[PDB]
Amino acid sequence: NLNAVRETMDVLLEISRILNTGLDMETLSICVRLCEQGINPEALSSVIKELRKATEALK
Amino acid sequence: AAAAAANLNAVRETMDVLLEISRILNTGLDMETLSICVRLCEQGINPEALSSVIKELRKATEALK
Amino acid sequence: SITQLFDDLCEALLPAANRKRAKRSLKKVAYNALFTNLFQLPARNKILMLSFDLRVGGLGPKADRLEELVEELEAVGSVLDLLVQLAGSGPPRDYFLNNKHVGRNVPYSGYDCDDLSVFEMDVQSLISREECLCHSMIQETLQVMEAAPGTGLPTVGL
Amino acid sequence: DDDIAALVVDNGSGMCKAGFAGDDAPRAVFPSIVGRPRKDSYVGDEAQSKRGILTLKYPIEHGIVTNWDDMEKIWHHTFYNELRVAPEEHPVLLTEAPLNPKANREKMTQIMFETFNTPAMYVAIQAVLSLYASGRTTGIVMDSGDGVTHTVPIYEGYALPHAILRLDLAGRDLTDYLMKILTERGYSFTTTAEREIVRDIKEKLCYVALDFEQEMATAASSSSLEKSYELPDGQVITIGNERFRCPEALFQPSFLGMESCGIHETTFNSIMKCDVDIRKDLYANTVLSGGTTMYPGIADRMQKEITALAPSTMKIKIIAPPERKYSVWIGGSILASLSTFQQMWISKQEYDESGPSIVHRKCF
Amino acid sequence: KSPNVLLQNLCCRILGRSEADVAQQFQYAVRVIGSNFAPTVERDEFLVAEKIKKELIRQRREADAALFSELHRKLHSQGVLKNKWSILYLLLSLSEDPRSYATLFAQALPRDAHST
Amino acid sequence: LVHRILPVAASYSAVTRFIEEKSSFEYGQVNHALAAAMRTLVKEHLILVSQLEQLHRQGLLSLQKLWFYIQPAMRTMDILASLATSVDKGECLGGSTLSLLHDRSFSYTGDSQAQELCLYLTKAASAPY
Amino acid sequence: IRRYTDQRSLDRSFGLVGQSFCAALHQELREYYRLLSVLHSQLRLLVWTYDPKIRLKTLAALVDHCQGRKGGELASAVHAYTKTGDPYMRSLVQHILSLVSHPVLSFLYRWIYDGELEDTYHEFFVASDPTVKTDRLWHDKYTLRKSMIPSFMTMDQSRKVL
């Protein structure tokens, strides 16, 4: 199973590159594994922009 | 308002004139689907490009029938 | 597996130059921002509706790639549902632009100077960085060379 | 900040955890023991070490305060001798185990306001801090602690009282069940010292099955799941077969003979007594908590059982942190550090204007 | 609304099926409509009216071609419509007779003698 | 300063003659498609010069600007001028003028400026062969 | 620096490493002509030149050390200034060290896999021996020329590739 999800993740990198996302490899891995568990992804799209903003307020 | 409804009355007229011209050319579009195509025509559209899709989905409303 | 990757995410947002308590405070602000919003249509069609928005503003082959890959990715949808909303949070010649000399293609095209004028912009986009550098090295050093004495660089503030 | 600092004390059953808000671990650790003639005013190293001739008791060991003198005494010695701090410079956040009575919280605020004279106060509940540590505020939490178990649904940020199910399970009955199986098997065990040695091995060496069927099959073909432990204390006690069977008895309670309902049926009934439109969203957040942190090998079994329970018309999402032991602590340490949370922290003025029992109602 | 969801409203109007049934057609529709959102040819509504006239002569109804002039008047009378060219060209493209040479006669200028 | 800029002008003024001359039917058939691929990099050099002259109208171009702008072209066009004078000096057509490209794609491989040019000229010149 | 990057660009006998060192020197040269581009239109030149008095001073030492140097002797004349403890000088010398390092690793893609050997221009360490191919092509055909061993590699990296 781990061979399949790795290949699908490698394909998921290129389409998140041309769609101009804020993701790099680490937040792609955490958020794809989070989506695999299954919750509404429309709220995850807001929590990610909040996490980066709330770290940026410290800097 | 009221002056926003007199304009819309003058738009309701125009839409009925385009409705006559729509029915004598016997388009399969009814009053609802045509109201999507007029909103498309407001934003700018190439109706040769819309017509090629509508000539296929109307033949593919009867392909899976 | 999510609980180790959220730890790696908190490792990256920590600047690595102590620094074993700051990670946990970043974890505090991380959970404190995670539960804020939680307090208060197919997958691939969302890609199709934006591939149309791609095609209107030029760049045909990018939409051609975007639509074929999600076709074989549907032959995981929650990831694309995550991606359609993160598509605006990103960053803020060779030998083929107007090559009409070599090739087994017919040379038959009319003039409009709006294929060549966005071939003058393909060069000017290199030049518009390489000209802003010439402006932004003298202003960046004249804003630091000139100040008040004693507050001119913070290393005298030690 | 430059304001007067806050304080968090989680008075547990195994140990007492005190600390200042926004710290990594609790800043200072005591035993929960209150020694009396079986010192009389001391808790510490001497009180735990002299526990053979002094009384061994903890104020919460059942989900509710068993002895009140115990509670006041452990709270006074941890506030006065460990921290060395005075109440006028420290508003304190208290914690209670799930389904602690409103009148107990009234009595608690009253005694803390009179014999202790706190300037401001907060009392919370256990499972909400556990979920706040797990980074959500709406979900279902299955908390089986050290005296008490509850399947708490929580939606909008506070628990639903029609739908919170009380369950009689603790880690105490697990260590008790280890005592029962060794004494029925024919091995001598009735003593406190060997209870602490089996508690230490239960915390550290434990490993728990993925299934009821498969690990009995592998032990039935020929048994080998033994992780050999020779302790430096001098005793040699380890059997690999018994320890994956010890917490497994919650899956089928008639293994032990336990009066309490099985875990699968309790979760199903807890989702059943919640609202039907909010049903899917509440079951998409399942949380690890409490004294059942003996080994995280049960967590995989728990996720498997919840996958087997759930249909395709509902969602699962089980958050699986190894932050499950100190979860109650880190919740309160998150909350009282913030300055915007002061709007839900009750003062002296409002406590005088709206009575004692309003701490039950303002807490959310 | 926004144009991208309006395409979806179209694909629910014409088909009796929802978008969950078939999504090959909506992808192919995205391939057609995209990069065609701007008229790169002249938008004279006069030529488009004179093409409906040729169309109704080709269907042998001169009374319909002469009521068409009153209906073409009514658009001038209100004048609230913005592109009169597009909607009549759309209704003309879906022409149907209730009961050969057409590219040889009048069409709009290509703009190959002007910068597009 | 203008003496220093003269090499890229010299490797233009002697390459377009080659492009015109070796597109006649008396010059092999691979030697045609070699010179036909020397036009992709002359388009860039012409459009750059035009862009600088249109900047000059508003008052936004000087000589030092041109001198730092032309630094990659001074290498790339010079390689083409050497190829042109080597084809003219001998009698290289066919596989022999396809020998020079396959050799020059090796004689600088560490540069990745004098590899990439020849690595395209190779695939473009050898369409007939 | 303006003289050096022009003289070795009309010399195609400066090899595959030197024609990359000069290409890096061109881009370094480009910035001090950005300065001379802006300065003539404005016509102090004291305040403005304090920071180019340091960078160009370093660039002259880099040029003077690397006069007539190529091959593995340019792998120890540009890497000889990256061993400094200042990240500012590390960042300055990089974009020159990368461009000199790429020919060395281009020769090592044709001698870690099959390709063309490099000692027609002596910038690699292998000195091959012609007409010995009977069985000594597994023992003695490849002398390790010490003068072109790169000093950003050790012996275990500049041999066991052989």
Curated annotation (Swiss-Prot), chain B:
GO terms for biological process: gamma-tubulin complex localization; microtubule nucleation by interphase microtubule organizing center; mitotic spindle assembly. It is found in: Cytoplasm, Cytoskeleton, Microtubule organizing center, Centrosome; Cytoplasm, Cytoskeleton, Spindle. GO terms for cellular component: centrosome; cytosol; gamma-tubulin ring complex; interphase microtubule organizing center; spindle. It comes from the Eukaryota. Associates with the gamma-tubulin ring complex (gTuRC) consisting of TUBGCP2, TUBGCP3, TUBGCP4, TUBGCP5 and TUBGCP6 and gamma-tubulin TUBG1 or TUBG2; within the complex, interacts with TUBGCP3 and TUBGCP6 to form a luminal bridge with actin that stabilizes the initial structure during complex assembly. Interacts with TUBG1. Belongs to the MOZART1 family. Required for the recruitment and the assembly of the gamma-tubulin ring complex (gTuRC) at the centrosome. The gTuRC regulates the minus-end nucleation of alpha-beta tubulin heterodimers that grow into microtubule protafilaments, a critical step in centrosome duplication and spindle formation. This is Mitotic-spindle organizing protein 1. It comes from Homo sapiens (Human). The gene is MZT1. The chain holds residues 11 to 75 of 82 of the full protein.
Curated annotation (Swiss-Prot), chain C:
Disulfide bonds: none annotated. It comes from the Eukaryota. It is found in: Cytoplasm, Cytoskeleton, Microtubule organizing center, Centrosome. Belongs to the TUBGCP family. Component of the gamma-tubulin ring complex (gTuRC) which mediates microtubule nucleation. The gTuRC regulates the minus-end nucleation of alpha-beta tubulin heterodimers that grow into microtubule protafilaments, a critical step in centrosome duplication and spindle formation. It is linked to Microcephaly and chorioretinopathy, autosomal recessive, 1: A syndrome characterized by microcephaly, cognitive impairment, underdeveloped retina and choroid, and epilepsy in some patients. The more anterior parts of the retina, near the periphery and pars plana, have a grayish hue and diminutive vasculature similar to retinopathy of prematurity. Visual impairment becomes evident during the first year of life. This is Gamma-tubulin complex component 6. It comes from Homo sapiens. The chain holds residues 3 to 195 of 1819 of the full protein.
UniProtKB/Swiss-Prot annotation, chain F:
Ubiquitously expressed. It is found in: Cytoplasm, Cytoskeleton, Microtubule organizing center, Centrosome. Changing residue 39 to C: In CDCBM15; uncertain significance. Component of the gamma-tubulin ring complex (gTuRC) consisting of TUBGCP2, TUBGCP3, TUBGCP4, TUBGCP5 and TUBGCP6 and gamma-tubulin TUBG1 or TUBG2. TUBGCP2, TUBGCP3, TUBGCP4, TUBGCP5 and TUBGCP6 assemble in a 5:5:2:1:1 stoichiometry; each is associated with a gamma-tubulin, thereby arranging 14 gamma-tubulins in a helical manner. Gamma-tubulin at the first position is blocked by TUBGCP3 at the last position, allowing 13 protafilaments to grow into a microtubule. It is linked to Cortical dysplasia, complex, with other brain malformations 15: An autosomal recessive disorder characterized by global developmental delay, variably impaired intellectual development, speech delay, facial dysmorphism, microcephaly, and varying degrees of cortical malformations including pachygyria, thin corpus callosum and subcortical band heterotopia. Most patients have generalized seizures. Belongs to the TUBGCP family. This is Gamma-tubulin complex component 2.
Swiss-Prot record, chain G:
The lineage of its organism: Eukaryota, Metazoa, Chordata, Craniata, Vertebrata. Component of the gamma-tubulin ring complex (gTuRC) which mediates microtubule nucleation. The gTuRC regulates the minus-end nucleation of alpha-beta tubulin heterodimers that grow into microtubule protafilaments, a critical step in centrosome duplication and spindle formation. Belongs to the TUBGCP family. This is Gamma-tubulin complex component 3. It is found in: Cytoplasm, Cytoskeleton, Microtubule organizing center, Centrosome. Ubiquitously expressed. It comes from Homo sapiens. Component of the gamma-tubulin ring complex (gTuRC) consisting of TUBGCP2, TUBGCP3, TUBGCP4, TUBGCP5 and TUBGCP6 and gamma-tubulin TUBG1 or TUBG2. TUBGCP2, TUBGCP3, TUBGCP4, TUBGCP5 and TUBGCP6 assemble in a 5:5:2:1:1 stoichiometry; each is associated with a gamma-tubulin, thereby arranging 14 gamma-tubulins in a helical manner. Gamma-tubulin at the first position is blocked by TUBGCP3 at the last position, allowing 13 protafilaments to grow into a microtubule.
